[PDB]
Ligand binder design. Structure first.
Ligand code: HEM
Length: 280
């Protein structure tokens, strides 16, 4: 029963783009780290129907890399617009107690918005990983555009989880004009631009209640002209891929690092990688 465990998360609003070749960078394994748990969330269009047939290649490439490192895939779940995969080092697993469960929440009739929660237990501590997706236009349970639903929040339960992570595009944007956002970016005034970011506004409205984002030090991860580092100012620069954490039982969770991966340049959005240490 280790005192601490490490967790890496990634999310990428990747659209139609296919898993890049350099998965080690994407997962934060390129400096020799061996985290205990890894979660990968993606948002896009048509994963389920899998018309480009990227499905088989995804499995093969992720499985090859991670199985050699001693990971077991607990669950992969895909909808039309979301994917969530969770991996755990096989050595931590006990079949009797693992209680591996996943739910999908569909909030419209087109099954396009909502979320996924995958949860499991190790050392009698329960982990939950959520991703979610909301479009600007939908009628929602919160009467906001934000990709929060109480059904996806396992801190609210009578049997709440110990360690929870929410990764993806929360549909939180920077609420200022493009000119002024670009100006703040050019000055590297990240906190100044974050003053316009909607996460704090969603929290004021008691959404994402008790959920913490690690300090953001990196520039907005959208919208880029593909294969450049230049913003396309047809959209106001925004942080579209986020990692939040909390415990539902007062456990300590410590962010180790939180960064966009600016080398993945082929799409309009940059993926975001977070690293954590949890105390059981
Ligand atoms: C860079 C973007 C993407 C990332 C990071 C990603 C990640 C993943 C991961 C981690 C898995 C499970 C791997 C495993 O089994 O260990 C998976 C499976 C899958 N993905 Fe993605 N994926 C991406 C793009 C796509 C796209 C564009 C499509 C199709 C439009 C797609 C369709 C599928 C399908 C069908 C599966 C499950 C296949 C099976 O279980 O037989 N993915 N993806």
């Amino acid at each position: 029963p280790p005192a601490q465990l490490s967790v890496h998360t990634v999310s990428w609003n990747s659209g139609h783009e296919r898993a890049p070749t350099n998965l080690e960078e994407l997962l934060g394994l390129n400096s020799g780290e061996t985290p205990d748990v890894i979660a990968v969330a993606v948002q896009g269009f048509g994963f389920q129907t899998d018309k480009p047939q990227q499905g088989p290649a995804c499995v093969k490439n992720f499985q090859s890399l991670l199985t050699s490192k001693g990971y077991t895939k607990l669950k992969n779940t895909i909808t039309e617009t979301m994917g969530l995969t969770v991996y755990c080092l096989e050595k931590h697993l006990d079949q009797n107690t693992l209680k591996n469960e996943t739910i999908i929440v569909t909030v419209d009739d087109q099954k396009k918005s909502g979320g996924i929660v995958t949860s499991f237990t190790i050392y009698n501590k329960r982990f939950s990983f959520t991703t979610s997706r909301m479009s600007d236009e939908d009628v929602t349970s919160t009467n906001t555009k934000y990709a929060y639903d109480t059904r996806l929040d396992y801190s609210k339960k009578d049997d709440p989880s110990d360690f929870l992570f929410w990764i993806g595009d929360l549909n939180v944007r920077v609420e200022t004009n493009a000119t002024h956002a670009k100006s703040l970016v050019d000055q590297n005034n990240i906190d100044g631009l974050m003053a316009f970011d909607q996460l704090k506004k969603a929290k004021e409205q008691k959404l994402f209640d008790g959920w913490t984002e690690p300090q953001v030090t990196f520039k907005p991860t959208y919208k880029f002209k593909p294969n450049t580092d230049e913003y396309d100012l047809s959209a106001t620069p925004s942080w579209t891929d986020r990692a939040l954490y909390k415990s539902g039982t007062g456990k300590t969770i410590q962010p180790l690092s939180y960064n966009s991966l600016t080398n993945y340049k082929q799409t309009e959005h940059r993926p975001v990688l977070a690293k954590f240490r949890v105390t059981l």
